[PDB]
Amino acid sequence: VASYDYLVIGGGSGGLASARRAAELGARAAVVESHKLGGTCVNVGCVPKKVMWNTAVHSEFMHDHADYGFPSCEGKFNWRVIKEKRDAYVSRLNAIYQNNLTKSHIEIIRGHAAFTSDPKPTIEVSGKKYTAPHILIATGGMPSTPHESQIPGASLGITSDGFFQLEELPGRSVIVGAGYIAVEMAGILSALGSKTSLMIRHDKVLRSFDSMISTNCTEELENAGVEVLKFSQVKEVKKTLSGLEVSMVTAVPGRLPVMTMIPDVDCLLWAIGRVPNTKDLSLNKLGIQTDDKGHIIVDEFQNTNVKGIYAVGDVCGKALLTPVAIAAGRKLAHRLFEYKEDSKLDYNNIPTVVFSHPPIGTVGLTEDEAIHKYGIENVKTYSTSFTPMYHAVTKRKTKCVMKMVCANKEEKVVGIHMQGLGCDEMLQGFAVAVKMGATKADFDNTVAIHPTSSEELVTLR
Amino acid sequence: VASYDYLVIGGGSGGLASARRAAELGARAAVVESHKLGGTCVNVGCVPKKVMWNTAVHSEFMHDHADYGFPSCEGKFNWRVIKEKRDAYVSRLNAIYQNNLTKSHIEIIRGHAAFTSDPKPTIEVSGKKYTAPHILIATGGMPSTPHESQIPGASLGITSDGFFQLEELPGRSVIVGAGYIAVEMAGILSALGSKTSLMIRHDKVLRSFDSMISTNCTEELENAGVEVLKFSQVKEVKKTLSGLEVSMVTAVPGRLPVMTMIPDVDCLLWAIGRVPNTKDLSLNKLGIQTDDKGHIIVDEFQNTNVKGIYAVGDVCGKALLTPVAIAAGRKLAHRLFEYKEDSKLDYNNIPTVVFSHPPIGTVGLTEDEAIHKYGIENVKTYSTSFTPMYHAVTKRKTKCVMKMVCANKEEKVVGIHMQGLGCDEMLQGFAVAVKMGATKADFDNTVAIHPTSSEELVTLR
Ligand SMILES: Cc1cc2nc3c(=O)[nH]c(=O)nc-3n(C[C@H](O)[C@H](O)[C@H](O)COP(=O)(O)OP(=O)(O)OC[C@H]3O[C@@H](n4cnc5c(N)ncnc54)[C@H](O)[C@@H]3O)c2cc1C
Ligand SMILES: Cc1cc2nc3c(=O)[nH]c(=O)nc-3n(C[C@H](O)[C@H](O)[C@H](O)COP(=O)(O)OP(=O)(O)OC[C@H]3O[C@@H](n4cnc5c(N)ncnc54)[C@H](O)[C@@H]3O)c2cc1C
Ligand SMILES: NC(=O)C1=CN([C@@H]2O[C@H](COP(=O)(O)OP(=O)(O)OC[C@H]3O[C@@H](n4cnc5c(N)ncnc54)[C@H](OP(=O)(O)O)[C@@H]3O)[C@@H](O)[C@H]2O)C=CC1
């Protein structure tokens, strides 16, 4: 049995960030990875999604070209061109990630790890055993898909993994779900020319976001040509002569339910959540606790129920974002190898951007969460809605909406929510201010930058 | 003589903001304006410049269209199209500004104001007299141009005012100066297809900015096809058969000076600073102090040397930016009509964006200013330079550079400087954090947003 100071199972965002910081602190560390270094972020997530988002953004600016004084463009998009370049960039990052590990003197162990039944926690990979006093599980997640028993033909649909294998633009797309991936993917496909429907169980997308965002985002999808099918769910999927036929039930409250078939569908995309990757770890051999979905249960320091075993990232099922996995991983390394007993990630005030069109930025509490926490007499909100001056000269319009949620007599800024051109790059600095405990006076006494969209946040009344 | 509570001379950014807030507090207020409401910002400054900047940005994205999978566009720009739409938008804002005053019950007095020799401060407009216990001078500035005695033919050149009257794209442009307007205008003209030279007295533009910015911006202009003529100055300008001929002297240190003529110039643009608009006010009749350039001297509360007379904005010659004029104007109104004796604008940590390509954002101290203030053993800087992932798939590249200047053991963040895609909308929230006295720990303990350019500011090492 080979002993290390730190053994990390999974070479994605959280595992790599933790292993790298531990190694800097002198730990002899090893990372086990069964597939590609960089994990979801690099291979089938953040990075290739952002490339496609930039592509979809080009398409929108193509629409405004004539408005801005140029000749209009015909613009038949070639999916194969950008796909090849996107894959090449992913390959470059895979190589960079490997180099980063080698330079940090971290051993890479290739294969699938599972725990053994040995007294002290030990893993096996390809018949060889490894142990350490500290073992991090950072195995991430995978897309959730319906069971064929519940939805016949569900396996004819793809997930976000399959989206990145597509080699041509689907003519007709149906996306099912109402969260991050559904919104981003519908925006990409629609902007690039697919006839796109988004099928959602209720009346709005992103229902866990502030109501102003959920409402505005649903409107913006419609305005961009996405057909939003409300109160609708898939009943069955059949392979026909010319693509898939999707049977759906629409059940609007106060009406009779109605069944419709959607013919000639080229791509059906399930975007209904993620499930943790823990089934094949043999967690039961050590009695590591999981919830009913398979997430590893941790305390505020990322400890599992077993001494010397930790978990970070998507596998724990909380705030499923690349930078959260990285920050939790790094804080854990400082606790273990720098002996900072109080080193942990604060899960409050995590900012997030949804790469819709226009993009959404949010940090902190929604108006409803604030009312629940502080009481309705203690919450004040300020908001504005305007058309960005980019569109002063265009026939196409998008809106910018911004809301600030303040609490108590001082009007501490407890939440900021916005959607609009530029909001993807606008949010980070406001999130620092929110984290520091800014009040509305702190915003108001900062001098504006003009003419920008961002200055509206410091001049709310 | 008609008496008011508050009389504001000039209906630009500072005067309008002050008059509006005073009126909200109950003051009976009047604004005197000789030309168009909205002043420089609306008519010949911020707003029409931003429209042209958005146009120049479209041109850049046209260049990357084929890289992103679309067919390339020929793209002969039509200047007349965007000019007409830009003027129409300006007209809309003029009407909105007028309505805003009427709704606030502020009287508009049309004409040119001058002080009279009356005991108590009194103005005259078109032969009628007005007085108030509080009179704000907010008359702004105008472009500086060389004297014909110093540069023969200088009057053949135009200024930024003239730029907004152009009805066609000049084929060949020479811009003289090395500050904000020179950089922005050269970027606009060059992106839209003019053969553009920028003539500067030293080796870099924006020399009062942090050295990392001055260096990077000069490089980016060159990379974008602007010819930067260093150590060069105009000696004479002559009208020829086919445009202007510009005689210049280039005097590189350590070399012999050399004279060159630039033939066939269509547009020569003087962008060499601004001068205050005070000559025709009859300031001498009350002994209001000015400096040698004509700026009205004020104290930290915007008081002139004469009781009951104040000045804000570009006329005072300090931090010549629209939001500074607005903030100083509003703070003054609260001091006078809400009796907040301590109400004043803090001129430290004012943020600014230069709309170059890519845009620049800066707030706080440059590295040199920090070293001077705190001492060299007390200043630490962190910086990064990277190619934004927008360009991962393009043949054209721009850079993103970011620098954080920290002071003392706590590493208080005393300056942030950056240039790069998106930096125009990124800066405002970091400026709030800087204003609140953030340390580098405050940045580092904010969770990043991925994938963005803005997250690099919270992950510097
Ligand atoms: C389509 C999509 C787009 C997204 N876009 C964004 C975004 O824009 N911004 C953002 O912040 N987040 C985004 N996310 C979420 C983000 O990608 C994840 O939160 C983050 O990647 C999780 O990092 P992790 O370290 O927990 O897991 P992963 O990165 O998934 O790493 C887990 C690694 O463990 C390996 N592994 C699993 N089991 C074993 C085994 N037993 N033995 C050895 N190796 C194993 C896997 O191969 C994988 O490489 C997106 C997610 C998706 C799917
Ligand atoms: C090309 C250019 C681009 C710029 N871009 C930006 C930018 O992007 N962002 C930014 O923050 N700043 C920018 N600025 C600077 C900004 O426009 C000025 O700082 C701001 O407009 C000054 O406001 P003010 O109230 O001091 O003066 P002004 O807006 O100039 O108002 C002065 C008003 O007084 C009137 N007036 C003068 N004398 C009299 C008289 N005696 N009687 C009656 N009325 C009189 C004038 O007609 C004018 O309307 C730009 C400036 C220029 C020239
Ligand atoms: N930009 C970014 O940072 C991105 C981050 N991510 C991360 O990955 C996570 C997972 O993404 P995603 O897959 O979109 O999951 P989400 O959990 O964000 O959303 C899925 C939504 O789909 C709806 N849904 C759930 N079950 C079904 C079903 N059986 N049939 C139809 N609809 C269903 C639910 O909404 P409803 O109740 O309203 O029906 C649910 O909230 C995200 O939450 C995020 O943390 C992913 C993509 C981009």
Ligand SMILES: NC(=O)C1=CN([C@@H]2O[C@H](COP(=O)(O)OP(=O)(O)OC[C@H]3O[C@@H](n4cnc5c(N)ncnc54)[C@H](OP(=O)(O)O)[C@@H]3O)[C@@H](O)[C@H]2O)C=CC1
């Ligand atoms: N985005 C924004 O907020 C904008 C704001 N503004 C505001 O308006 C102000 C004035 O703009 P601008 O006119 O560019 O003035 P600036 O003062 O910003 O810059 C002019 C520069 O030109 C050079 N210069 C000065 N005299 C001469 C001369 N005789 N011959 C050749 N070069 C000369 C000097 O630099 P050097 O010593 O290196 O030669 C000088 O610093 C700005 O400072 C800014 O406050 C203006 C435009 C955009």
